[PDB]
Amino acid sequence: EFKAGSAKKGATLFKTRCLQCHTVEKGGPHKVGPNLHGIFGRHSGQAEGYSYTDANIKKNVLWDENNMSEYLTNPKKYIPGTKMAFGGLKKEKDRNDLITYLKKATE
Ligand code: HEC
Ligand SMILES: [Zn+2]
Numbered sequence: 001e002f003k004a005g006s007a008k009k010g011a012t013l014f015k016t017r018c019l020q021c022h023t024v025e026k027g028g029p030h031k032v033g034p035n036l037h038g039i040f041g042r043h044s045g046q047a048e049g050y051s052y053t054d055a056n057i058k059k060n061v062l063w064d065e066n067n068m069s070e071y072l073t074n075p076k077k078y079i080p081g082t083k084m085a086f087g088g089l090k091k092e093k094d095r096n097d098l099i100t101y102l103k104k105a106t107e
């Protein structure tokens with residue numbers, strides 16, 4: 001299950017693995033992937049002005065720390081048909097660290 005990790009390690013993981021396709025700040029632009037502001041507590045496939053796949057919308061997951069960890073373990077396994085071209089974060093340490101950071105960065 002999800003447990004709070006290191007947000008500093010999380011921020012680096014975000015910069016090096018996620019930032020190329022995602023912004024986190026309020027009003028931040030959409031890039032290859034949607035801006036993630038307010039992602040926790042919002043259903044999947046609902047960021048304003050972003051064109052998602054039917055699969056992402058269909059999943060209809062209410063994003064929380066635990067399901068985000070499961071999704072980030074392997075995105076294509078959790079949401080079959082996703083256009084998010086990312087293999088996943090295989091270490092639970094990395095997922096805990098990234099999510100601790102993301103919970104704050106996207107608030
Ligand atoms: C580009 C090559 C991407 C990288 C690198 C990462 N993400 Fe991604 N993500 C991307 C796209 C194109 C999409 C839309 C997928 C679709 O099928 O429509 C996404 C989506 C997400 C989501 C869900 C958004 C939502 O439901 O509103 C999340 C939570 C997400 N991406 C997180 C995320 C993180 C934390 C990553 C780094 C570890 C990451 N993404 C990398 C494209 C790309
Ligand atoms: Zn719901």
Ligand SMILES: [Zn+2]
Nearest residue numbers: 026038106107
């Ligand atoms: Zn906010």
